[PDB]
Design an enzyme around this catalytic site. Structure first.
Site, PDB file in Angstrom:
ATOM      1  N   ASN E  92      18.390 -15.357  -9.649  1.00  0.00           N
ATOM      2  CA  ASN E  92      19.069 -15.665  -9.184  1.00  0.00           C
ATOM      3  C   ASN E  92      20.275 -15.146  -9.802  1.00  0.00           C
ATOM      4  O   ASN E  92      21.443 -15.703 -10.664  1.00  0.00           O
ATOM      5  CB  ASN E  92      18.674 -17.123 -10.410  1.00  0.00           C
ATOM      6  CG  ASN E  92      19.650 -18.291  -9.356  1.00  0.00           C
ATOM      7  OD1 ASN E  92      20.675 -17.689  -8.749  1.00  0.00           O
ATOM      8  ND2 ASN E  92      19.659 -19.138  -9.764  1.00  0.00           N
ATOM      9  N   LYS E 144       3.955  10.918  15.924  1.00  0.00           N
ATOM     10  CA  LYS E 144       4.907  10.469  17.295  1.00  0.00           C
ATOM     11  C   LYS E 144       4.076  10.495  18.880  1.00  0.00           C
ATOM     12  O   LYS E 144       3.786  11.066  18.731  1.00  0.00           O
ATOM     13  CB  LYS E 144       6.077  11.370  16.790  1.00  0.00           C
ATOM     14  CG  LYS E 144       6.411  11.315  15.844  1.00  0.00           C
ATOM     15  CD  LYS E 144       7.739   9.498  15.719  1.00  0.00           C
ATOM     16  CE  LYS E 144       7.754   9.286  14.737  1.00  0.00           C
ATOM     17  NZ  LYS E 144       9.491  10.208  14.598  1.00  0.00           N
ATOM     18  N   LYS E 146       5.307   6.367  17.955  1.00  0.00           N
ATOM     19  CA  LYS E 146       4.536   5.275  17.054  1.00  0.00           C
ATOM     20  C   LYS E 146       3.851   4.679  17.970  1.00  0.00           C
ATOM     21  O   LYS E 146       2.628   4.836  17.746  1.00  0.00           O
ATOM     22  CB  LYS E 146       6.204   4.753  16.212  1.00  0.00           C
ATOM     23  CG  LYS E 146       6.834   5.381  15.375  1.00  0.00           C
ATOM     24  CD  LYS E 146       7.801   4.367  14.674  1.00  0.00           C
ATOM     25  CE  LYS E 146       8.472   4.722  13.964  1.00  0.00           C
ATOM     26  NZ  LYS E 146      10.222   4.036  13.797  1.00  0.00           N
ATOM     27  N   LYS E 170      -0.396  10.877   8.637  1.00  0.00           N
ATOM     28  CA  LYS E 170       0.295   8.746   8.530  1.00  0.00           C
ATOM     29  C   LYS E 170       0.716   8.140   9.178  1.00  0.00           C
ATOM     30  O   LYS E 170       0.620   7.996  10.315  1.00  0.00           O
ATOM     31  CB  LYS E 170       1.926   8.912   7.629  1.00  0.00           C
ATOM     32  CG  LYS E 170       2.636   7.522   6.813  1.00  0.00           C
ATOM     33  CD  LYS E 170       3.712   8.044   6.539  1.00  0.00           C
ATOM     34  CE  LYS E 170       4.545   8.055   7.319  1.00  0.00           C
ATOM     35  NZ  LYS E 170       4.946   6.738   7.911  1.00  0.00           N
ATOM     36  N   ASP E 172       1.997   4.958  11.365  1.00  0.00           N
ATOM     37  CA  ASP E 172       3.502   4.117  10.502  1.00  0.00           C
ATOM     38  C   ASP E 172       3.407   3.156   9.871  1.00  0.00           C
ATOM     39  O   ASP E 172       2.793   2.425   9.874  1.00  0.00           O
ATOM     40  CB  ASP E 172       3.662   3.826  12.492  1.00  0.00           C
ATOM     41  CG  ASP E 172       3.368   5.264  13.436  1.00  0.00           C
ATOM     42  OD1 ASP E 172       4.087   6.026  12.544  1.00  0.00           O
ATOM     43  OD2 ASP E 172       3.394   5.420  14.423  1.00  0.00           O
ATOM     44  N   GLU E 173       4.528   2.632   9.846  1.00  0.00           N
ATOM     45  CA  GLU E 173       5.136   1.801   9.393  1.00  0.00           C
ATOM     46  C   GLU E 173       4.544   0.473  10.425  1.00  0.00           C
ATOM     47  O   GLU E 173       3.577  -0.567   9.817  1.00  0.00           O
ATOM     48  CB  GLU E 173       6.453   1.001   9.424  1.00  0.00           C
ATOM     49  CG  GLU E 173       7.858   2.056   7.991  1.00  0.00           C
ATOM     50  CD  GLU E 173       8.676   2.629   8.693  1.00  0.00           C
ATOM     51  OE1 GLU E 173       9.169   1.927   9.341  1.00  0.00           O
ATOM     52  OE2 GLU E 173       8.919   3.286   7.868  1.00  0.00           O
ATOM     53  N   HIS E 263       4.013   3.199   0.741  1.00  0.00           N
ATOM     54  CA  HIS E 263       5.298   3.717   1.794  1.00  0.00           C
ATOM     55  C   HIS E 263       6.528   2.264   1.437  1.00  0.00           C
ATOM     56  O   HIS E 263       6.759   1.451   1.418  1.00  0.00           O
ATOM     57  CB  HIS E 263       5.224   3.169   2.880  1.00  0.00           C
ATOM     58  CG  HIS E 263       6.236   3.877   4.479  1.00  0.00           C
ATOM     59  ND1 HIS E 263       7.444   2.849   4.748  1.00  0.00           N
ATOM     60  CD2 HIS E 263       5.721   4.845   5.058  1.00  0.00           C
ATOM     61  CE1 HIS E 263       7.359   4.006   5.273  1.00  0.00           C
ATOM     62  NE2 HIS E 263       6.642   4.790   6.157  1.00  0.00           N
ATOM     63  N   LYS E 303      21.279  16.351   1.764  1.00  0.00           N
ATOM     64  CA  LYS E 303      21.710  15.226   0.236  1.00  0.00           C
ATOM     65  C   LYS E 303      22.831  16.421   0.031  1.00  0.00           C
ATOM     66  O   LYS E 303      22.513  17.136  -0.031  1.00  0.00           O
ATOM     67  CB  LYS E 303      21.021  14.521  -0.247  1.00  0.00           C
ATOM     68  CG  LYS E 303      20.601  13.264   0.446  1.00  0.00           C
ATOM     69  CD  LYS E 303      19.588  12.628  -0.692  1.00  0.00           C
ATOM     70  CE  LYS E 303      19.030  10.745  -0.249  1.00  0.00           C
ATOM     71  NZ  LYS E 303      18.190  11.455   1.191  1.00  0.00           N
TER      72      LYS E 303
END
Lengths: 106, 434, 430, 131, 430, 106
Positions: E92, E144, E146, E170, E172-173, E263, E303
């Site tokens: 909060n 791929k 997905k 992996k 996927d999500e 993940h 990056k």
């Protein structure tokens, strides 16, 4: 009056006599002229309890003639004399597989 | 064929007889279709012994007054079927044989489960006797509202209409067919706000009031967690729509209610698909015998008051099949096989037509003490509500129970005892006109 | 009444439509019985929860009969319960007295209510992936004789059918357990006949082990034992055992990887009359919403154009995702199955060797073909009788995978496969 | 891309709509970021059918009074998501798409669970009424 | 108030420090908001149980923003609960109205409170011992496309990636279970693609089977099934499913020997904005204290120096035992992990063949490298596309195990491995 | 345009062409000059599901030159012609293992 002997008789299109070069390309011509994707698969042993067959180079998305789908298996004759080569046919859209026939056997 | 039609075959006392009502296609003779309904319910059209496991037609008996129809009595042996499985009687007998194409219609009229095969079943959880001993309600046909409106009532408003009916002398109160759980009324809350309304109406008036909580459910896990919750609310009785939910879920709940002391009210939902046409289907006296062998302390046997003499002799035929120990072969009264139930417990016969006050002479005379009388199904309630509406349905009971217990012939002196009980009851006098 | 017949009610996409086939009593008008088949299937808080009729559509070619389209709301019915659809809709409506015969023809479960159900455990696509059987309709014996065969002699007849290239082998209706053959020993000596017939011919052989039982505790301990024999498939007589035991076993077979062969035992009590009952395309929708990876759809060979239009009508309803409203084919409502898995359509009549060209054209790849139904066996036994039905299968799939029109070049491809098969050439005539 | 921006697509009554509040990085046009928030929440950038499981942006509707911001209405189909899983709505829709680098900020404003997909859930245990 | 800003409070070694990044409203002074971000994250006794602020440290290079170090006591928080740290600290306090944007940058779980947690099920060292994969950063496809792929065609793409020397693959999500691909059948046809790809190439192949589920009963029966397929690893979208479901699954994966691939789905709702949210180095500490043997740390290649200083900032926080307070690298508190097991740092951006010299130098041995993230696949498929990413891996580990400076001699060791590898030489350009 | 054939391709440093005598000693020189402990391991079969490789004589705690770490494998050439010999590299302190490369194969 006779029984059936004990052979392997692998998956499908396997109780009929083994399909010759005309019947290979006529089924390959059935894959492309019905809009399915002719993929080539191979495996060491052909029992249908080994569930995945190893895919040869590509599944041939833009394959339009049987003279070149078979010519990719012509590149797979000399590569794998001991593997059960197979041209499968995948559905273009609706997530299924239809044709399955061994073109070369050890 | 005609190896399955043995007309000299006196059937053994351990066979499982079955009396079809075969309406064969024309040109098919009667013996060859009756051998065929004995064929494809067994030993279909040597690796085994045929003569030990085959169904044998043993009598034809053409139906009087109607050609192209007969009553093929088939004699299935005992050791063809499963111990304790009334869903293997139907899979064997009415499984593969009605869609047989040499037959225009085929109706399983009656079936004789022998004493050898009744003993593998459980019977009801509680009989007539043990149901009355658990409820402490002797010598009267029991009662019930049916909560109108069916749909739309939230679970507390539903339990207020239960508590209102259960005050005024009503014994039970039925939960509907099309109420199992639905987004306006979940079962966990419907059972909760009915247990809070039984123990208010049971504590108010000292009788053991109950409510037929509907445990019919999508899965047998969801059914038993729906019945184990009505056990843990200390409910006396649940109910179950046994022909939609089937005989595997019924016999699961049969065995549960015997092992948990809950009464089971079997409701005959989806029965009229199969017992309503007079030429094809499964007559309800098969489906009445089929749930006396699986569970149920009550079963709806419909009503009598809207039916002829011949259509209520058949209805009082299967009321006796599910309620009496031994029932003699009487075909005018509908029963085709003499049926010893081998001291299997009885099932109540529930009267649930469009019935009201003025039918208490009729349904205490026709259906005896060993019965339950539902109400509110077709008749339009009561002007003063439910608790004067239920006291009207209870003073009219015990007037007709008192009259029957004094020699007064309720067939002839029945409308007198409704009118002379409407004097001493203001709740019944306003129900005396409609 | 006559507030339950609302003919301007264009039905919502979330309603659960039902198309009865009312045959009212003489003197009963068609608006009043259609408001009455919508009456006692509800509300015998009423404007939102009412089963209401919205169209009449009299049956063409016949008087005194019509097709009352009832529009039940969604929130009347239980999420995930097909024993509440049949309790609500066909519970207390067929016994209504102003109706001589009432038949539920078709029903439209919406996308809103199909998502509450499980569907089949495994579809067409998921089942064929598990079995690794692609591009051909599967096979089946039914072990004749039905009764009497001890658990090993039953298993020996299973081993003999499954040697000859037969994919599956059905356990009977009335074989659950019985003093000549208990299920614990039937399942043992069948799973010992599958691991020999799968080791002999490497294909994934299976047997529809009948788990129909008296109780749901005795049904799951009969299916948990077929799970621990590593069996691919079980079966279940879903109308004698009901939709609470089937939906119990549906949820189990999805959660234990066992395929489910739903058998339509006792289906013909409730549909075989053309004016009263519940037509099988409702019961085919009812077990696609409970489980089943297979369902018997009878046969096509002994049926006329209309009777196999209707038979191919519900075969598309239990196997295709979207089926358009085509009343001549029998489907009364456009049914969107909302990506629910399909169910196989198992042909099981009196079909034999020569019906392979038809039943690879009529029933597609997504089918199972049973045998031994009415035919007088095979003169050389089972393992030739299954190799006959497997060569004649794949002779028709070979011709179908070469463009040959199996309506006309179909009897040719059996006769040119009887040369390269001796077990076929003796079933070629009888 | 712009195969995921179908502006004529009237969404079905069984789609799972989602109204993002996309604040794209400059130089990214509005359709190509709205096709991108429909991209990486599905079918990411012929092994199957794309046009059946793809998220489709179907309307842009720029936010009044503030440039570089719009409301990309995305139309995810029903059979992409799990029956009964509200942690698969968020794993699909707001999973891999806010950290997308052509976007300076992305806000899932609203979402339309259809009647087809609400029925797989349970709802509250007890409503207003049953509480 | 202003009893919650105690600037002389040298914080105890048992406190749970939190370094917010307050951006207060205009007119709000910095002492008053820092006593207010310590206010409503406590006590909205007081001397023993208040979260108190003890340093301001304004953000260099920017006005109207500072880094309020809050010092919560230990005995305010639940032993072993990271859903009580985020309920107490960031419950909060972000909605407090005198704050334009409040961002939790870093947090210091002490040695006293790390010991109440489990840590990862298996560390870096224990995971690599179970997999027998030493001295190189591991690999990964992401399958791929997905969506859409049926459970076997998904498994065939898993078998094809894992043949080409790829360690993991992996899930996927948004693949948990969906009407085209159920988890029971996705897990079956993947574990049948691992036992072929592990028998073909003898290495321990694995697949991050997604056990993220609607309920914790449906998550553990989705993980107890990946246990009984003898699977090495599962995965769990840990922010959509929460920290009660991870800590449920952490305690399971430690007690069933399954590795856990956490993940970071939905991570960027709560850390993409540089002024408001919860920075991922808190959420990386939060799942090192719940379980995970892996965590996505995004990528380093796209990056700048500061954005990969921060990215290597929390990579050391989730992988190294002791990390010194280095605010330029982003770590605001010296974190002693008290011999807690490490977590892998899984690189999963748009990385490809040519980023192997960087990502073996930047991410060390203790890393997993995912592929297929943004790149346009491989022109020869998956099994060449995985052999490209495995030869280019081990060409960079071969050069690293020979002292070759992979910042400058890194592009040379790809190009001198494209000669002795044909699958690499076609991914050498695209 | 070609696929990958089906070989074992054992653990690590195994998809690259097999490392010669220069690349053996350069990795051995990476073990000692980075302070790791060069241990020699051998095993009958080299799948990475047989989890322990049998340690040759010692893990060579005080090994300082590559001319003697390899000379211990020179004592292990003729001893085991049929075992997958391997020089592993253990961390001196922090409980991990880094280098792994087969020096001799059957």
């Amino acid at each position: 009056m006779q029984t059936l002997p004990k052979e392997r008789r692998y998956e499908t299109l396997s109780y009929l006599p083994p399909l010759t070069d005309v019947q290979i390309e006529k089924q390959v011509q059935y894959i492309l002229s019905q809009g399915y994707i002719p993929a080539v698969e191979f495996n060491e042993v052909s029992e249908p309890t080994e569930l995945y067959w190893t895919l040869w180079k590509l599944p041939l998305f833009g394959a339009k003639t049987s003279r070149e789908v078979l010519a990719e298996v012509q590149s797979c004759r000399s590569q794998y004399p001991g593997h059960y080569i197979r041209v499968v046919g995948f559905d273009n859209i609706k997530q299924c597989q239809i044709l399955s026939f061994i073109v070369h056997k050890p | 064929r005609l190896t399955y039609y043995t007309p000299d075959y006196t059937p053994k006392d351990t066979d499982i007889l079955a009396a079809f009502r075969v309406t064969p296609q024309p040109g098919v003779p009667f013996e060859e279709a009756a051998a065929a309904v004995a064929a494809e319910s067994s030993t279909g059209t040597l690796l085994t012994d045929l003569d030990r496991y085959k169904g044998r037609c043993y009598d034809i008996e053409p139906v009087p007054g109607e050609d192209n129809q007969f009553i093929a009595y088939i004699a299935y042996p005992l050791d063809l079927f499963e111990e304790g499985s009334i869903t293997n009687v139907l899979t064997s007998i009415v499984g593969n044989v009605f869609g047989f194409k040499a037959l225009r219609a085929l109706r399983l009229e009656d079936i004789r489960f022998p004493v050898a095969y009744i003993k593998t079943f459980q019977g009801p959880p509680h009989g007539i006797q043990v149901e009355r001993d658990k409820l402490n309600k002797y010598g009267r046909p029991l009662l019930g509202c049916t909560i109108k409106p069916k749909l739309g009532l939230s679970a507390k408003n539903y339990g207020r209409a239960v508590y209102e009916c259960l005050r005024g002398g009503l014994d039970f109160t039925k939960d509907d067919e099309n109420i199992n759980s639905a987004p306006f009324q979940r079962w966990r809350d419907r059972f909760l706000f009915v247990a809070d309304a039984i123990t208010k109406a049971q504590a108010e008036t000292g009788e053991i009031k109950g409510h037929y909580l509907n445990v019919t459910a999508p899965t047998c896990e969801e059914m038993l967690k729906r019945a184990e919750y009505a056990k843990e609310l200390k409910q006396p009785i649940i109910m179950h729509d046994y022909l939609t939910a089937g005989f595997t879920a019924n016999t699961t709940l049969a065995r549960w209610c015997r092992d948990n002391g809950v009464l089971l009210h079997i409701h005959r939902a989806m029965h009229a698909v199969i017992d309503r046409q007079k030429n094809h289907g499964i007559h309800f006296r098969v489906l009445a015998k089929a749930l006396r062998l699986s569970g149920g302390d009550h079963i709806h046997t419909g009503t009598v008051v809207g039916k002829l003499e011949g259509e209520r002799g058949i209805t009082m035929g299967f009321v006796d099949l599910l309620r009496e120990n031994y029932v003699e072969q009487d075909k005018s009264r509908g029963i085709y096989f003499t049926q010893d139930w081998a001291s299997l417990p009885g099932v109540m016969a529930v009267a649930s037509g469009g019935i009201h006050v003025w039918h208490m002479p009729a349904l205490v005379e026709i259906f005896g003490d060993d019965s339950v009388l539902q109400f509110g199904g077709g008749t339009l309630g009561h002007p003063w509500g439910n608790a004067p509406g239920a006291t009207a349905n209870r003073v009219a009971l015990e007037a007709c129970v008192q009259a029957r217990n004094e020699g007064r012939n309720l067939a002839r002196e029945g409308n007198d005892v409704i009118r002379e009980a409407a004097k001493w009851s203001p709740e019944l006098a306003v129900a005396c006109e409609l």
